[PDB]
Design a protein around this ligand. Structure first.
Ligand SMILES: *[C@@H]1O[C@H](CO)[C@@H](O)[C@H](O)[C@H]1NC(C)=O
Ligand SMILES: *[C@@H]1O[C@H](CO)[C@@H](O)[C@H](O)[C@H]1NC(C)=O
Ligand SMILES: *[C@@H]1O[C@H](CO)[C@@H](O)[C@H](O)[C@H]1NC(C)=O
Ligand SMILES: *[C@@H]1O[C@H](CO)[C@@H](O)[C@H](O)[C@H]1NC(C)=O
Ligand SMILES: *[C@@H]1O[C@H](CO)[C@@H](O)[C@H](O)[C@H]1NC(C)=O
Lengths: 29, 49, 100, 99, 232
């Protein structure tokens, strides 16, 4: 990634509790 | 937090209802839980759509 | 014969036999009237001496306190997940691939 | 297709080590009972209730139980038991109910 | 003789353990910035409604217990908890108090002349002690918290010490002093509090939801920080 993109991904932000209760997040393809 | 809701039953978890009530007396409580848990699921699916 | 719910350490019930517990294994548990399925692991958290079994956002018994050994445990559910079957086609071949 | 899970192997009971018996003889096989205006209150705690010797006293006209189901008096374990013993007539048996 | 109390009177409502959970509890916590009465040295008598929050800052051991009851005579039962500098004892039955109950080598027990029909008994400025007594479902509970230090600044979480299943009405409150030191007493009210937990599992801050509309907005957003905008 470019330094502009390196600044871009750093400006965008428990998962175990949701993972236990039947809620799973599929990773992007 | 809606899973954490009681939905008008005696308890918000099925383990307590299984430990306290017999299955025939817990039929109504399980029915009252599903009627509302499936509704929350449908509302979440509609919002996601 | 009035009764109150499990908001305190239990005192009076039947003479059920209390067997020894195991750790890091898929075993059912019965801690003072509540039952569930999972594994028992040692925890590094802290429970004030007056604290009973804990709870979470989803209102489940994540951690329990042993009334006999006064020990520290966690409750976590079993290894579960979705299974995916890769079918290239009914007319092509009967071979499938299993994905977890 | 579906969802897989790991089945449990055995069950573990971790009840506290209580050996003394509850004094059910002084509340069920008492010489006399109080009235409905001066009903007694007995604190039963820190003992074991077998829930099997009460059936040898007399046949029960009603066994109504709100909340906890009779079949499951042994699986649960309570922390405080209150007893209110008094006597009523036959037409006033159904009056022991809320509302 | 009136001083406001802020960020005091918060105790654990239940017996559950939560970590990093912004759970809201409705109980009898002391309202924030509420007027309480403080007497300095007597032993006046105060009504006991709902719950009573008690605080004390002394240099030596001056408070020698409390008196609870309804009429404080030989007609109705009264509750007495006293410490004789060795172990705290709890005994609630029919007492008979004098006009000026006081304690004076702590072997000058003269709070009551004689007792009868006893029902229950039990045997167990750098100092700050806080006590909370309340009656719910006929279950007496005592919350205690001691820490070294005109209310002190900061926050403190009160922990339960003993549990008493007395199940009697209490409407008369009276403290006991030592003769030969100021104490803070307040009245508890039903309020809604948003408690915050951490990784260790202790309360570091609390919010009284009925103090100011900012706290109501914090209750609505379920967070301690509110951003720029308009909220209903
Ligand atoms: C009974 O349980 C207590 C826990 O409260 C324990 O301290 C004690 O050693 C036990 N007694 C036995 C196992 O004989
Ligand atoms: C009640 O106590 C009397 C006193 O001896 C006894 O004879 C009677 O069998 C008891 N009733 C029972 C055990 O049901
Ligand atoms: C408390 O009451 C006193 C006397 O009326 C008054 O001077 C003081 O400002 C009050 N403080 C609060 C917290 O209202
Ligand atoms: C306790 O005393 C108060 C005041 O005397 C009274 O209002 C209340 O009804 C009493 N409690 C009971 C259970 O009678
Ligand atoms: C509180 O947490 C800190 C770090 O998170 C830790 O160093 C400290 O030991 C904890 N306090 C207690 C009493 O465990």
């Amino acid at each position: 990634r470019s330094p502009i993109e390196d600044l871009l991904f750093n400006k965008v932000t428990l998962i175990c509790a949701q993972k236990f209760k039947g809620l799973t997040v599929l990773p992007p393809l | 937090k809606q899973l954490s809701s009681k939905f008008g039953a005696i308890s918000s978890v099925l383990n307590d209802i299984f430990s306290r009530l017999d299955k025939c007396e817990a039929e109504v409580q399980i029915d009252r839980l599903i009627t509302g848990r499936l509704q929350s699921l449908q509302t979440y699916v509609t919002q996601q759509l | 014969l009035s009764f109150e719910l499990l908001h305190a350490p239990a005192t009076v019930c039947g003479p059920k036999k209390s067997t020894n517990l195991v750790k890091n294994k898929c075993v059912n548990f019965n801690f003072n009237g509540l039952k569930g399925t999972g594994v028992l692991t040692e925890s590094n958290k802290k429970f004030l001496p007056f604290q009973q079994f804990g709870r979470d956002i989803a209102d489940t018994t994540d951690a329990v306190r042993d009334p006999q050994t006064l020990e520290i445990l966690d409750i976590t559910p079993c290894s579960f997940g979705g299974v995916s079957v890769i079918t290239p086609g009914t007319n092509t071949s009967n071979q499938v691939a299993v994905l977890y | 297709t579906s969802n897989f899970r790991v089945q449990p192997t055995e069950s573990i009971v971790r009840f506290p080590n209580i050996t003394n018996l509850c004094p059910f003889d002084e509340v069920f096989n008492a010489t006399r009972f109080a009235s409905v205006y001066a009903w007694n209150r007995k604190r039963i705690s820190n003992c074991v209730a077998d829930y099997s010797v009460l059936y040898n006293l007399a046949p029960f006209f009603t066994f109504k139980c709100y909340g906890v189901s009779p079949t499951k008096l042994n699986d649960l374990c309570f922390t405080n038991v209150y007893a209110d013993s008094f006597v009523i007539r036959g037409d006033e048996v159904r009056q022991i109910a809320p509302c | 003789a009136y001083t406001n109390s802020f960020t005091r009177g918060v105790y654990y409502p239940d017996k559950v353990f939560r970590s990093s959970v912004l759970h809201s509890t409705q109980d009898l916590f002391l309202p924030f910035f509420s007027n309480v009465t403080w007497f300095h040295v007597d032993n006046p008598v105060l009504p006991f409604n709902d719950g009573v929050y008690f605080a004390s800052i002394e240099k030596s051991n001056i408070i020698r217990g409390w008196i609870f009851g309804t009429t404080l005579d030989s007609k109705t039962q009264s509750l007495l908890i006293v410490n004789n500098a060795t172990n705290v004892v709890i005994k609630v039955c029919e007492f008979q108090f004098c006009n000026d109950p006081f304690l004076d080598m702590e072997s000058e027990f003269r709070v009551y002349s004689s007792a009868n029909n006893c029902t229950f008994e039990y045997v167990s400025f750098k100092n700050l002690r806080e006590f909370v007594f309340k009656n719910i479902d006929g279950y007496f509970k005592i919350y205690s918290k001691h820490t070294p230090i005109d209310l002190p600044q900061g926050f403190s979480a009160l922990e339960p010490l003993v549990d008493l299943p007395i199940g009697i009405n209490i409407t008369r409150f009276q403290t006991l002093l030592a003769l030969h030191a100021a104490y803070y007493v307040g009245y508890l009210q039903p309020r809604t509090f948003l408690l915050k937990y951490n990784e260790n599992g202790t309360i570091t801050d609390a919010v009284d939801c009925a103090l100011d509309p900012l706290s109501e907005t914090k209750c609505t957003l379920k967070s301690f920080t509110v951003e720029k905008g308009i909220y209903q």
